[PDB]
Symmetry: D2
């Protein structure tokens, strides 16, 4: 009694076969998108079948088996409701309420220190969800590219710890928040930057990646790495933001020369080239949709959820989530850690890279920032989310009062 | 087919009578103690039955049913391996190796500013486990009484947030760590102590509990909460420690008056009386085993694991856990959050109150402190614990490299 | 060839028989007062001759000599214009213009944290001058008693360096200003208060004075010493201030307990007793006129200018003046040192103890303090004084542009 | 009678003619140099007279008049012993004692971050005196050129206050010492550097001087300014140290970008070019003797003591001396102010620019620095000088215990 046939009848309702649209609809309702890389063969076999019989197609059991056999295990988990969020249709309904609610918060100031950022309209607002099992949901402007800015800091920290290990990386950068009044100091008592989530630390981290090769190859290697983290969804580069960040960033040059003088770089660092590498990394483009997959790689222990590929070592993933917890929303980090309890990372383009470990990854994006540098809609969304679901890090998974737990049906 | 029935067949394993000791040995091997408050009716019936039938010692199906009918639900989960840690026998093997490995860590200095903590032998070393289901295990000197000291700061903060709620409590005290040299500034920029886990924060929080009645009743009020949290195991009091804490507490007096000058207490606070209360709360005694139940209650979203009693609101538990994470280990807080990633609190007696949310609570006691005030052996144990098991708060439950997950078997 | 009437003709004006009023008036015109202790005998001989005769009286070349012979050398410099300010009468004319100019300044708030300090009227305003030669001038409420408060800090520090020397004293207290927003810290990086002019330093200084003996005898000794410093003009004690300063002294008890815990006191100190002694010293009363003598003892290298008695070692006077320069006006100290350039010390009763080295001492008193604790009228008077005369510590004695030099005559 | 003649009678001492050498020796012993600018006429006539009348050579009274007539006033004060240090031959013997004492202090380390200062032998040790009246004395290596380094910081600040006034300049820089081990902060809380005497402060002052012209002209305008201050003694320039200072100046570029980002420079500043000007001003060369004249101009209210020329406004001179008092010896400033009480500035090349207000200026030079950056020999010298002489700024001029007063005689 084989899986492909049990599934066939589970979808077959006792009618002797299954219309293709009716398989596509049942698939989409599990959260999986028909373009999921892990479903390629199934979809290739489907489109081959719709070249044959162009009147239908209506699939019997061996023809259904013919398409679905290569992806049956992933399909059985989808259809039997084994994903981390079983009733994904209900849950994306709540995401949308949360989306509409936060959309009413028009406050904040679009970052304008740079013309590329000032140009973005304050009304742009998108939330994208990718769960640990590949369930996708978007609402809003989830396909408009924008710059990762400081959202790239946890990613490139991840890469560095991935390639070099925790111990090496933290020879050069701390692992604690500075305290709501060393905001302004570049270095802790040990003469290292306080953590990889602030600019001095991000800049040092940058000097660690793929040492020995030139900047063009370093950027290629980070790009190929982001490509894997996003399951080959959109990752681009904004040369306008780049040129302009590097002509309008005296603060970072001040940090660079400070780091150089205190001997904060590995031996042989070319500090002015590192800053230029840094500015490019800040100008990498993503969409809400592709950036949520990247977070979901981090929610999923370093496996990209829509491709199954191992992208980052668990160590790198745990360090990254750890520092995003305490250091990820700038001056709001401790408040965010207390009330939201989620690892998150914000950037000046208006994005919050949000990770719900073991559940989902998310990317919120609205250009208007509050006075601490965080997207107003983004922040408002993060508070709502944790007020709704027991996703706060220290919510209890058994006794969670009247909050909703999307991981369950009852 | 009733459940006391199905389970009777589960234990009988072929025979039609079950020897009593066979049911007891099966019970103990689930981690449950035979003294479990949730098992009293069943254990009273087994005692009575052995009195009225020394012509055994074997339990019919009808007889086994008269004994377990009371506690059948729990006994079901214990026996159908439904507890948070199913193979508890193997897990305690690991706790014992962890215990032995930390035991060989002879360094440190016993706190001798009081002649009551100075008396304790450096060789005392105890580790007690109580899971979210009541599963108990202890190794080492887990029945020696010692003073909580600063391990009581999360407990009384939890009581404050329980009775008064998050917004009121944090009018008087912050929710962030300070910075690894703001250890000496009693106040943050809003003239609030930084968090409840430092002395000025504990002192201010002590002043929010049971306002308006004397220290006799305030104390009894807190003790009664500490009894419910520990499932009514040992919660004592060391008047010897308390007299010396108050004869030798220049700094807290420095803090108390400084707090009074800055208007940090609620209106009509008798600060010098609040310091005396505070010194009393520090002198409360526990054992590794009784305190492990307190940790387990915070592990369990505020329900005591061996009684089923709701002791704390989720809100209280979530805040307490949030702040033990980032502030609970003094100047080691940030490194502890990074490498161990578990809510913990330490005290100058040598305790570390340890919480694995949704899994278990623990208490580790060894008096010799490292130069940052934390028990050497406790600290070494906590690192090994999370090297071995995917209990780091930002470990992943599905992809955890070479770590072991005791929540599943095979 | 006698000095005694190379002078009576200096006074005689060709006429050969000097009236008394005309000798007193010429005396007063030099700045000396008819009650100068150095002039007692000459005034004793005048009191006797004024009863030998009611018909006059007046003097000739031998009963003049009869009265003045005892104090001739001091009289000769007085009448030959050899004092530090020759044309004293035009100088008091400027002090009066400075006085009245500052009286128009109604800003400020009278310290009211003490009902004694809130008792005093905002309209009180007095400036008192005593030069290094005993020349006196007053204008305004220069006889109203008021507490020294922090004005006593340089005095008791002087006494302390006097009795124990520079090296011993600075084992316990620093000799620099802190940094204009590390006022809040009680201890520098060596665990000493920053300087004797802040409350932590003053409190440590208080613990050095007359160690071994008790508070009643210690207060008598400071009083004897203040009495010498002030040429036995008015010094007293306000108990109302004392009792109110010791009820409302939470900050000082914070310093006391902080100091004791960091082991900041000489071995054997009774901290709580030192604070009461400290509170007494702040309650010591003076007048403008009497305090200006105390300042003039410091202007004059430690000799009281109206008795000639050597009250303080030079060491003590230099150290005191050094630190009143940099630390004596609280958070205004560095501005004050920059613009006024005079060793000065303020207190919350409204007093500015002002010293012009090698020239004069003063006491300004007006109770309305500014936002930084300094008497408004006082500060304003001090700026005017240095705008007008080249008394700025880094004015040039030879080239000084538009400024007047009262020490000269062209 | 005439003053040339009266003075001729005093040097002739009975005979009818004064040998020329008898008059030169009389003049030199006053401390004046035979090359004094204010003496060129008299000295030109003396050389011309030894040509036109080789017959001797002895100056009758008519011939002595023809030589000293144009310089009679200065020669009078020189010979009626009316200079600020009357017995200059006795005081120089003391400077020589102070010199040789401090010579035996071979400790400290020569600045080596730049090759051209690692050049200098650790045994070079020169002390030069120039009084407020032109009396000169040198001992040691007083004609070796060295770089002003930070000794230029009071000079250019003076130039800036001279041309711009106190109020404008101190919109851009403060006037207080920072706080010891608060040397790291480039900015105080008004986002101004702390004082002109630290690098951030100096760099901002550099950008106020002569806004609107290129570095060629800014530099020349400062140089001609230093020249007048040195009475046209040697004021050089080490293009070697400038090129090197600019290659290895990471901290300064760090300061530069930091200040530009904080909007610390006058509008329209070319910060990179301001840094190059700054590195130039640091490379200006002097000698002990020439810089001793620059300090003497600061000793003398801004008049160059050997030319009579007004160089700096008294305001400029008083601010500079105020800030050298509190901020001029790096982290030793507060200790230096306390024990030396003399306006001084130090530099990495080994120089201490020292000012005894109203008396003399000095340059001590020895390349080995102590750990705080201050010349070990210079520091040792300054302490000896003030232990010997009542030159401490808060020494008393009339009561100075056993200290010696070189302003006095018998
Ligand atoms: O330990 C050293 C040596 C040392 C070492 C290294 C450098 C300097 C000094 N010195 C000292 N540490 N602590 C001292 N005094 C205790 C009594 C009063 N205390 C205060 N608590 N909070 C304060 N500030 C605010 O509430 C406001 C604020 C918040 C954030 C930023 C700015 C202002 S004052 C602590 S003395
Ligand atoms: O912050 C204000 C005043 C201000 C301005 C406005 C409002 C309030 C206060 N001014 C300024 N902030 N930042 C400035 N410049 C940056 C250049 C690199 N700087 C560093 N200095 N020190 C660092 N770390 C250590 O030394 C290690 C350590 C930490 C703790 C204890 C002991 C040692 S990094 C900061 S200048």
């Amino acid at each position: 009694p084989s899986l492909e046939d049990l599934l066939f009848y589970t979808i077959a309702e006792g009618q002797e076969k299954i219309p293709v649209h009716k398989f596509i609809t049942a698939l989409k309702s599990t959260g999986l998108r028909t373009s999921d890389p892990r479903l390629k063969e199934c979809m290739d076999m489907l489109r081959l079948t719709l070249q044959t019989t162009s009147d239908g197609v209506m699939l019997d059991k061996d023809l259904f088996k013919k398409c679905v056999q290569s992806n049956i295990v992933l399909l059985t988990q989808a259809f039997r409701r084994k994903f981390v969020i079983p009733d994904f249709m209900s849950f994306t309904s709540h995401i949308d309420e949360l989306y509409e609610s936060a959309k009413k918060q028009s406050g904040g100031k679009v970052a304008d220190y740079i013309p590329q950022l000032a140009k973005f309209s304050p009304d742009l607002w998108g939330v994208s969800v990718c769960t640990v099992d590949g369930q996708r949901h978007s609402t809003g402007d989830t396909k408009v590219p924008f710059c990762l800015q400081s959202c790239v800091k946890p990613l490139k920290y991840a890469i560095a710890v991935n390639d070099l290990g925790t111990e090496y990386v933290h020879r050069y950068v701390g692992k604690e928040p500075s305290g709501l009044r060393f905001n302004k100091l570049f270095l802790n008592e040990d003469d290292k930057p306080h953590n990889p989530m602030v600019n001095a630390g991000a800049i040092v981290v940058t000097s660690l990646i793929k040492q020995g090769v030139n900047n063009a190859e370093k950027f290629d290697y980070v790009m190929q790495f982001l490509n894997k983290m996003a399951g080959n969804e959109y990752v681009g580069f904004s040369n306008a933001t780049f040129q302009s960040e590097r002509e309008s960033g005296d603060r970072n040059f001040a940090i660079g020369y400070y780091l150089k003088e205190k001997k904060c770089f590995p031996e042989g660092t070319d500090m002015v080239g590192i800053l230029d590498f840094y500015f490019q990394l800040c100008s990498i483009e993503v969409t809400c949709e592709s950036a949520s997959v990247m977070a979901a790689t981090l929610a999923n222990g370093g496996f990209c959820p829509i491709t199954g590929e191992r992208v980052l070592s668990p160590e790198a993933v745990r360090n990254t989530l750890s520092l995003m917890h305490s250091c990820g929303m700038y001056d709001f980090s401790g408040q965010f850690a207390f009330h939201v309890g989620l690892p998150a990372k914000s950037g000046v383009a208006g994005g919050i890279l949000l990770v719900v470990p073991n559940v989902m990854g998310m990317m919120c994006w609205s250009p208007p920032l509050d006075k601490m540098g965080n997207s107003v809609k983004g922040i408002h969304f993060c508070h709502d989310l944790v007020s709704l679901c027991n996703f706060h890090n220290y919510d209890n998974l058994r006794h969670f009062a009247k909050k909703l737990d999307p991981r369950r049906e009852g």
